[PDB]
Amino acid sequence: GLRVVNLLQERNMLPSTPLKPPVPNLHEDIQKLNCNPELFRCTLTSIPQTQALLNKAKLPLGLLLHPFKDLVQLPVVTSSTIVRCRSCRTYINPFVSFLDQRRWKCNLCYRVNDVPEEEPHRRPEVQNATIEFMAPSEYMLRPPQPPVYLFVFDVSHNAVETGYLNSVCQSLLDNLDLLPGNTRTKIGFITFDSTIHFYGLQESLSQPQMLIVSDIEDVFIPMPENLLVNLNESKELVQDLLKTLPQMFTKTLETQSALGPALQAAFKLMSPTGGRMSVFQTQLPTLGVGALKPREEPNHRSSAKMTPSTDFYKKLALDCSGQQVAVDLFLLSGQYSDLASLGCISRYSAGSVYYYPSYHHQHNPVQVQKLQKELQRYLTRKIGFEAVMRIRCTKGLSIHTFHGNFFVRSTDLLSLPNVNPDAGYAVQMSVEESLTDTQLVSFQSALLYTSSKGERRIRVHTLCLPVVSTLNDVFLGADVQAISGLLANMAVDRSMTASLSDARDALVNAVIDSLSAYRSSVPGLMVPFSLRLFPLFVLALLKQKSFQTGTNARLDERIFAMCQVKNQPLVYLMLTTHPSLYRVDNLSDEGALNISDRTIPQPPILQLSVEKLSRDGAFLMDAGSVLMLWVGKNCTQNFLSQVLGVQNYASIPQPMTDLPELDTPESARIIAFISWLREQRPFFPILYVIADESPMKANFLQNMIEDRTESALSYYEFLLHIQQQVNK
């Protein structure tokens, strides 16, 4: 794959099969041990030898990691001692150098270490790039904290009208036994509006107790016990409250919400132990500390002129981090809520935000089932408490910028009050000292956390990459998807820091400078094979909710889009930015019918353009978190009756949540393909067939990032602008 591609001549560059990550140019025995690229990958699989060579390539050097990802198999070492390097404390990894059969050379600081009295090359710590240790006593600041779940609910008049509390309390009742933990599990509840409402739970009392703290400017804990109760001991007492809670605030006239003081009370309740805080807010905070001004929302006409409005939720997030308290924010607002400020509570506490625009129990069934499925994953996925993460790299390389939800302590120690398996992180590096002496460099991430069973564990991933000295070899190893993800994180920071214009300009100039630098080292737009999708993916970045310009997008939409860029793994960033488009009205037997009885169709991936569509058939779009099935106005009668279960195009339901399972082989094929798509991921993506000509579901159209619009270039128009600036 050494070829040179003319982007102006191909225009069908996107392959029909899923994009696989590049394989680093290593020796066959070194690459066979390399880490799973879904847990750890780099923008440049061939590391530049000098900073000057990196600067000439005009490509960003960095790492994207998914360290707590659910695994099929995990080696758990129980050794009496953890073998680390005597200098940089690097954990012994498959890429070290044994010399005297009881002396190993550290692959990050080149120091020779005594192989401890515990054939050492057969040891599992040297045969697995991903491994989990049992942390000894010196890795604990305190006894392992129990799992603590505190749920904070907005019960204002607007929140009651949404009806969100009915499904949240139902998901808690359904998944009460599925919450991670042992007998030490504790659970609590807080509701608020203009006042803070604590809930005491004791078996000695007939009913729970609703304790109202009305001093908003001076919050306190009204009861020393029974507010954070033991789950399995008070199971029936927790269940009765979850059945009564959605019924207490029906006639509520409280319209103001004091989110700030409520979070202050919730922090004080969890300050002794720490844990996970689940906050559910539906409107702009307007009462007490943390109040946020209203704002007029932009329209398609407004110029590019996002930052937090206050530092309250940022300061409060740092206090939560110091007590191992993480805050997950569930914003179900129908109007502006200043998420640019509210998100600071989850960013700096290793939480994550969940946005459900215009949630209503009766008026928005799409958001209703979206919240149901996301809460199913949120309450049942594994969890790690009071966690820290460190990222080490071979001497000569230096991490200079961290991306994700955490708090960077000094010495580049990532603090994670909670670590969750759906979080993604990114790092940007630079060559501080020339890698002349070495040919291989290594990267090692260590995740120290407390499990839900009360065990201190250490999860370690190690990656090894080769060093090159020619500009061509740097380009030959470029990971286009990883470069896209790192640029997205850099552009988000550029926005807060500078402006959305600078963010949009830095993204365009990343394609200009890299291809112009490539050109100056060899008519049309000539790119190496590894970068043939570089202008396409960047155009997709410039058109989606994070960075788009002449759209009618709302403020909280764009902020949540930027929060997902900073917090999601690379696979779901690529699935969201460049969805996969398949034609599904004509599935057949060329698929992965390998897995037993099931035959799974494998239709080819289509480039995101309306020109690829057709009014004669139906097209499914995999957007990562959602599956939109578009049905043409002239779809064949077979697809209507045998797949949709409908006699004519006119009779397809206004919002159709999912297809029926009908007794037709066409239905069996499409249920196979959709089931196979959803088995690839954790948050079950809801499939909506409501994309229709008249359903006002033009979200599907928004994703065709290659077509032009009255406010953005087409893909061809983009390539022409790139070539104009390359040959300037």
Binding site: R89, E138, Y139, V388, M389, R390, T411, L413, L448
Partner: peptide, 4 residues
């Protein structure tokens, strides 16, 4: 601080 931490020894991780």
């Amino acid at each position: 601080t931490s020894i991780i």
